[PDB]
């Protein structure tokens, strides 16, 4: 079948970065493979093939004449409906092609995301991850002489005033990363790609609904139609002027395909809606631990104004990559600290699991 | 089908160099795979196969006689048109082969680009990238003692006169690269390959238009034609001398293929036009940051006269490779400096992110 | 189809050596894949299959009798030509097999080149490349004390007499490589393989021409022939003694295959002629730079007498491998020196790009 | 087809060792793939398929009756020959299976060579190669102080008497390798595998000849035969008691297959004969250079008595592996010395190309 | 066909361990792939397909009526045998499925061996190999000062009394390995898996024999049978009440499949019997050289009592892995010592080939 090569040509499966969220991957997979799977199911060995159109020719007709009669009407599907208003049954002939066309349209947004946002996002993620990876040996290699002096001191002069200049010395501060984040916050060149990628899917789903409503849902319970042959050089002949009781064999496949196409997209729409709305708010589910690390406090510091910024998408893509191999470490281990108090445990946990 | 093996034989997918721009890759992919996909669609399981030609034989004829009648006219497609001027319907028989021929012609330019310009361009890119990679530890490993002396000095003697001999000493100058660029600027042996590769595509598109206009567009709404059998040893027989009402079954596929072939190339032409026009001007979108680095100033310095040189193509291919793994660094990070002023920030940023 | 597995069994695609010139690769690819592609095109889904031979049986005959009549003549293609001289139409039945036979013959020379010349040529190339790779740190690591003494000297005693003993001392001379080249120059054991590989292709092309001229070109416009059945146990029967108007369905495929087979080889012959003539002359397109390097002067020194030697083939295969990764260096960069004068530039260029 | 999977299941393609000579590889390839290729050619799309047997049923018979008549004789191929001696045409039905059986028999010896001689031969080759690889720095790292003393000496006391004790000192002698070779010379456990592997191929070729002579060559020009149906429950019926003029459709394929099977093996036999006779003599084509190296003289020393020993096969397999990566060196470069004399050049060459 | 995917799903082809003996691999391969190959051969292109059952309908019947008659008896294979005892011919319909079922049963034991014995055996082999690999530098790195003292001594005090305490000192003894072997000797948890894996194959072969004897061998020479149609709603009709002369087309395939199935297993049974009997005796074919090495003497020491222990299987699997890369050394070279005497040679050889 043709829908087999296209499957791995379209929907087939850096070096440490995930540039596609799992929900987006699932949405793309479903929205691309559903029409291909439906097309494969419709016209394969599962349902017996043969002649999609059959006609009840008179017994006087021969085999060749009957074949000509029933083959000159499949490419001219046009019901001479008396219920002389001639109605067309063309979707039955255009059901496969349209499906393939849909498989094209749902692949248009994906390429856009792979051609207008992947390189810049990859560069930003690489730079930010490289800068953040140096933040480990800066809270345990520098702030380590806090409890080493706390025991020979008291409350105010070792943990509420001493821990003020060590935090403001040229080992805790990252000015280049701060300025990079400040400059990227103003930019809006990447959120437009995300908005377009979701809006194109919404528009294509709406167009699919319109196509399935305007053209289908009319020829759906119609399985019989009457055609004519004497509309040309065969008019001057002695035979039936209007063919009688021609029946469509594959109406069940048509109905099943239409129902599945409706159901799949009516299920898929809310997921895309949620993906679009994910960028409408600032995320602070783990800001409590972020506001204490040397380099991670900058990310939580710059959360002001509207959330529609490049910084929002950068943070969203960085969160899914914060567990690669190196940040897949202590950062993922500060889950036991979930309820002054940070005098010991917050630092014994840090100095216990060094490496 | 034949369309399957040829696909991966033709349009199938150093070690760090990109020698094909994404636009050229897309253009080649579309222009090569469109005829293959069309000819696969035309003669696959999507549309029911069988006899492409059907005839209305008299009821006296047997099955074998009717098969002989309808099979001796498919290889002799010739309409005895009374509207005795005999017209030929040969494109219906030559529709697949022609498509395949097109799939060959569009592959001719690509091989040329892979056999007349790839090695020299690869060598030039390798040498230039290797020379430019040494430019990092020459503006921060050498010019580092400007701000280290600026504080113990004033305006004229540390940043407007001192920064004159350090820029003209045997650590800032690259004479070999300068002479290589000067000699390559005069050469014109590589722009000819680009011009030929685009002009061949233009000529082939024009030839496709001429073929689709002269031969098609005439037999397009014609689906019935009358043939003759008594033109040889069968003349001395008692049967119909001129066959009646022979109909072409696959006219819809013909129309769809012609329309798709027209539309795809009418869409593709402007992209190739833009690819041709890309080399008619000098590019200075990032020259502002280029005119300050030690080795990158030479690229911006030699932009004079006509832009039709080997240096233009070399710069075009180098820009797409300036973000590999090592130039995928600080060079891509001087985006925050976009608005004397360079007294601190232009050097603080340089000495902040060393490695 | 059978011609699909044979394609990748025949024409499918050390570790740093190229033992096949691109022209030879193209010639082999075309000459091997053209018959296979023609065979695939002739007998695949592109042209509708069925019965290659059709006959006009009398209406009294049944379906089984007509099938027997039209099936007992395909394996006995023999025209009882009255224009009683019985003519044979056997090529129509032998068109596929012959093609396959050709696809075997054109593969005979290639195996020879892979079994009689590949190992010795690989060994020679490896040894010569290994010896030549040591020539880099012998003109810049040794002759470097020439400009270092030129400034404190004059014309005759530092660059026309001093550069006479440093060139005749045990750092410039390669005696083993010189003797190896001298002994390989006399040998003629490898040029015979090249000559045989080209002459076999010429002979096979001539044989193809003879086969296509003697047997084809006679049954080319003939599409009808009369056969006989009553030539055995069926003689004692009451039916037609000579069958009437049997027609060959696939004449167009025959004509197309013959025309393509003629055209492809008539295009290919000049390329093989040029490949043969490539070895009839000494190549000195880059001898000007070669005669100055320490170890590369020996290659240009031994160009005397007839050019039909093993040294010619060794040089031809070495030139295509002179740009691998290490000779893909300065050697490829002495293109700027193309117009005493070598006093300055020829040495600063060498000592600038060391590594 | 079934012959497609079996191809790569049977004939499909340590880490530095070649345990199969090229001639043996070619012989196995041809003798295994020829029957498979013939079977694929016989019953594929190249020749039109259908009913291998056709019969001329009377016009009174229906389609079902004719099909039953012509289908009840294909599985009962038995000619009631009047030239009442009933002759059997069973090979026409057993042509494919027999071919497959042959494709099994020719694969029997190969497995034997892979199960009774590969491990021991691999171990012996590994040990011998490892011992011989240490022989390089023993004629140039030890004998190097011969010409260093020759110049301060004369003819007898530095090159004809001094070069007697250095050769008999504990750096030139290899006792373990000598004893291993002496013990392996007596053994005969591996030459039996080679003899059996060749004799099985000879016996199978003889059996193929006997099968093609006794059963074929009789039904070769016979294409018509008369069968009977009334030999059971259908005897009490009113129809033809002896069927008339039943013809075999695929006689040409039978003849072509038989001729190709004869020709391929009549070509292959001399190659196997030469492979068998290769072990009947001692090889001394390069003993002249072998008798001078420190460890390689032992191989040439033990060439006495009959040549049917394990040492012969070990040497044969070692010679093809003497050019791997390390012995692919000076050993292969000692070709310039092909015409006291060895005073200088024989050692200048050795000490020139050290590494 | 279904036989293609199941082949590589079933019989498809750590990192240094061989956990399957070659005989077991061959037995599994044959016993799994024989039914698959037979069922592929039975129903593939090699023998022409069509209707497996044919009937001689009366000439009055039409094509549709004859097809209904001959298609309503294939799923109701039941011979109304008059030689009114009705006999059933159901195996002809169940021949493929049964074969597939066999291809499942023969795969049941293999999975067991891969799920109940592979991990423990792999762990034991890894530990034993790791412990034994340290035994090299303990007989030549420790016992080396025997001959170094033998020359300055006599018979009793250097080689029959001195070599008594060096063999009982903390470089020759391995207590952990000795205790591991002692504890594993008592265990019987792994021999049960081997016994079950062989007994399941024996039982399945016996079941195959019973199935081929009870159901086959009765309908083997029977090719004609009479069926009935008037056994339902068609009873009240005017036609033949008992169908006449219905013949089975594919009896030859049935006979060939039965004969091959019998022959393959009657050949295979002795191999499995030998595999079972391999574990009934202690193996001491190389114990003579084993009783002298430092760590290998323990393996030979613990050979007492019944041989049905885990140690037997461990030794069997270790012997096939004693030639990997490191034990593929000197241990495989003590083959020259095959005929006080060990005074020199047994030590000269050991200290000759160190590494």
UniProtKB/Swiss-Prot annotation, chains A, B, C, D, E:
Positions of disulphide bridges: none
Extracellular side: 50-98, 222-252
Record keywords, A-Z: Cell junction, Cell membrane, Endoplasmic reticulum, Gap junction, Glycoprotein, Ion channel, Ion transport, Membrane, Transmembrane, Transmembrane helix, Transport
TM spans (from-to): 29-49, 99-119, 201-221, 253-273
PROSITE patterns per the UniProt record, alphabetical: PANNEXIN (PS51013)
Molecular-function GO term, any one: calcium channel activity
Sequence ranges on the Cytoplasmic membrane side: 1-28, 120-200, 274-355
Gene Ontology cellular-component annotations: endoplasmic reticulum membrane; gap junction; plasma membrane
Presence of the UniProt keyword Transmembrane in the record: yes
Pfam families: Innexin (PF00876)
Keyword Chloroplast: no
Localisation per UniProt entry: Cell membrane; Cell junction, Gap junction; Endoplasmic reticulum membrane
Sugar attachment sites: 60
Reaction(s) catalysed by this chain's protein: Ca(2+)(in) = Ca(2+)(out); ATP(in) = ATP(out)
Family statement: Belongs to the pannexin family.
Role according to the record: Regulator of osteoblast differentiation by functionning as a Ca(2+) channel in the endoplasmic reticulum which regulates calmodulin (CaM) pathways. Allows ATP release into the extracellular space and activation or purinergic receptors.
Subunit structure: Homoheptameric.
Annotated protein name in UniProt: Pannexin-3
Species name: Homo sapiens
This protein's encoding gene: PANX3
């Amino acid at each position: 079948s043709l829908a087999h090569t296209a499957a791995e040509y379209m929907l087939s499966d850096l070096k440490g970065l995930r540039l596609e969220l799992p929900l987006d991957r699932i949405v793309k997979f479903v929205a691309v493979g559903s029409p291909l799977l439906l097309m494969s199911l419709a016209f394969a060995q599962e349902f017996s093939s043969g002649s999609p159109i059959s006609c009840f020719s008179p017994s006087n007709f021969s085999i060749r004449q009957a074949a000509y009669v029933d083959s000159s009407c499949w490419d001219s599907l046009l019901h001479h409906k008396q219920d002389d208003k001639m109605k067309s049954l063309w979707p039955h002939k255009a059901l496969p092609y349209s499906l393939l066309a849909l498989a094209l349209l749902m692949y248009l947004p994906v390429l856009l995301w792979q051609y207008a946002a992947v390189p810049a996002l990859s560069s930003d993620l690489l730079f930010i991850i490289s800068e953040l990876d140096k933040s480990y040996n800066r809270s345990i290699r520098l702030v380590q002489h806090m409890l080493k002096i706390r025991q020979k001191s008291s409350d105010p002069y070792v943990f509420w005033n001493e821990l003020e200049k060590a935090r403001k010395e040229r080992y805790f501060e990252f000015p280049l990363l701060e300025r990079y984040l400040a400059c990227k916050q103003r930019s809006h060149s990447l959120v437009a790609t995300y908005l377009l990628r979701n809006s194109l899917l919404l528009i294509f789903t709406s167009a699919t609904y319109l196509y399935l409503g305007h053209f289908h849902l009319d020829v759906f319970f119609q399985e019989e139609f009457s055609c004519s042959i004497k509309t040309g050089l065969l008019s001057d002949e002695t035979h039936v002027p209007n063919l009688i009781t021609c029946r469509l064999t594959s109406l069940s496949i048509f109905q099943i395909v239409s129902l599945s196409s409706v159901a799949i997209y009516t299920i898929l729409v809310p997921v895309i809606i949620y993906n679009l709305t994910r960028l409408c708010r600032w995320d602070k589910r783990l800001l409590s631990v972020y506001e204490m690390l040397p380099a991670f406090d900058l990310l939580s510091r710059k959360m002001l104004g509207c959330p529609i910024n490049d910084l929002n998408v950068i943070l969203l893509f960085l969160r899914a990559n914060i567990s690669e191999l190196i940040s897949f470490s202590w950062l993922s281990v500060l889950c036991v600290l979930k309820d002054n108090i940070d005098t010991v445990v917050d630092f014994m946990t840090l100095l216990a699991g060094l490496e």
